């Protein structure tokens, strides 16, 4: 908690441009003017991550009522390669776990991953997420097209 070089910040119209710029380098799929418009309204659920006051990461979430459940869906969460394995991703995930924990009303949290994403599985599994489904050809135009669905229970 103390002496850490990593801080999260609110996303705002003033810095959204840079969120967009980070999601483009980190993630293989491109997001539309709707995704970003939407994040400006989700509050604590969209955060930029800084390492020594430099924006190197970001996470974007959404609330989901699917399957007759109250669900936290993680849409993006990542950080530029050179800054990985410094605990930045942990900062972003925990932040989100905390929101859920205080709110008390979530059944579970979840997200999709290209099955080739070995590091994201090591990462999310550390936190207690399990692979609960494997959808075939989930993504449209990237390779590979298959995706695991990851999920941690809260209730």
């Amino acid at each position: 908690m103390k002496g850490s070089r990593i801080e999260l910040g609110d996303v705002t119209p003033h810095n959204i441009k840079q969120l967009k710029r980070l999601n483009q380098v980190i993630f293989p799929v491109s997001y539309n003017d709707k995704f970003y418009k939407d994040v400006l309204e989700v509050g604590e659920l969209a955060k930029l991550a800084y390492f020594n006051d430099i924006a190197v990461g970001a996470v974007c979430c959404r609330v989901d009522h699917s399957q007759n459940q109250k669900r936290l869906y993680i849409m993006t969460l990542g950080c530029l390669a050179p800054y990985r394995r410094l605990g930045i991703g942990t900062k972003m995930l925990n932040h989100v776990l905390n929101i859920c924990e205080k709110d008390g009303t979530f059944d579970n949290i979840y997200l999709h991953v290209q099955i080739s994403n070995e590091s994201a599985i090591d990462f999310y599994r550390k936190f207690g997420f399990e692979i609960i489904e494997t959808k075939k050809n989930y993504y449209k135009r990237i390779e590979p097209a298959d995706a695991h669905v990851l999920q941690k229970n809260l209730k």
Partner: peptide, 4 residues
């Protein structure tokens, strides 16, 4: 990573 959604999409979509």
């Amino acid at each position: 990573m959604l999409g979509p």
